[PDB]
Amino acid sequence: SSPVVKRLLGWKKSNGQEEKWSEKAVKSLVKKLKKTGRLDELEKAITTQNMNTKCVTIPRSLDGRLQVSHRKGLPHVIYCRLWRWPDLHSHHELKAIENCEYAFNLKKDEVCVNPYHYQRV
DNA sequence: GAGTGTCTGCAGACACTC
DNA sequence: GAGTGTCTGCAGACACTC
Ligand SMILES: [Zn+2]
């Protein structure tokens, strides 16, 4: 419904039930980042595929999971699956870059969901 | 431990009224 | 804006399984 949501969805990697879910996951993150001003960095990382962009963080939940329309999962895996690796299955297949300040494995108060701060293992 | 799924009370989001 | 009430998505809480 938002234009940045429509813009970012065009970058999704690859029936109708999942099309609506992926939109929900995007709208969820966009709502969170509009508050922190890191929405511009996310668009820059997605569109330029630049590893040197800033960290795109969301608050860490106690168990690490993020719920989007009844489904639970680790946000970094969710957003790496969405924009980079649609076939991704685990957080073990992901290794954050050294420059990633808020990597998932660091267990900081904020978690980075910048797909270009993670490398497939 | 490691991972997953279901349930539910309430903060945040709307939707009003003066 | 201030105040109030309804609605609803999800974090936190359990409850399992290997
Ligand atoms: Zn990062």
Side-chain angles (χ1 to χ4, degrees), chain A residues 16 18 20-26 28-30 32-33 35-39 41-50 52-97 99-107:
Chain A
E18 190 58 34
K20 296 180 174 195
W21 189 84
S22 38
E23 177 179 34
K24 276 166 174 179
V26 172
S28 175
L29 181 58
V30 167
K32 292 177 158 96
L33 305 172
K35 303 167 165 185
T36 71
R38 282 280 147 102
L39 193 53
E41 272 302 312
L42 176 96
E43 224 186 332
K44 192 190 189 292
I46 295 307
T47 63
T48 75
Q49 295 91 51
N50 199 352
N52 314 68
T53 39
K54 297 177 177 201
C55 275
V56 179
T57 64
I58 58 150
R60 202 189 93 236
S61 63
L62 309 131
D63 74 357
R65 303 187 290 167
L66 170 64
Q67 189 181 308
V68 174
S69 186
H70 305 103
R71 273 161 59 186
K72 289 195 163 285
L74 297 175
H76 70 123
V77 177
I78 293 170
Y79 297 112
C80 282
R81 197 186 278 117
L82 201 34
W83 290 299
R84 291 194 83 181
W85 305 294
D87 57 326
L88 189 85
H89 332 262
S90 186
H91 65 95
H92 288 109
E93 288 172 274
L94 294 170
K95 167 109 163 190
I97 62 157
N99 177 91
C100 178
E101 200 193 319
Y102 298 93
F104 158 89
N105 73 314
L106 300 188
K107 303 293 179 161

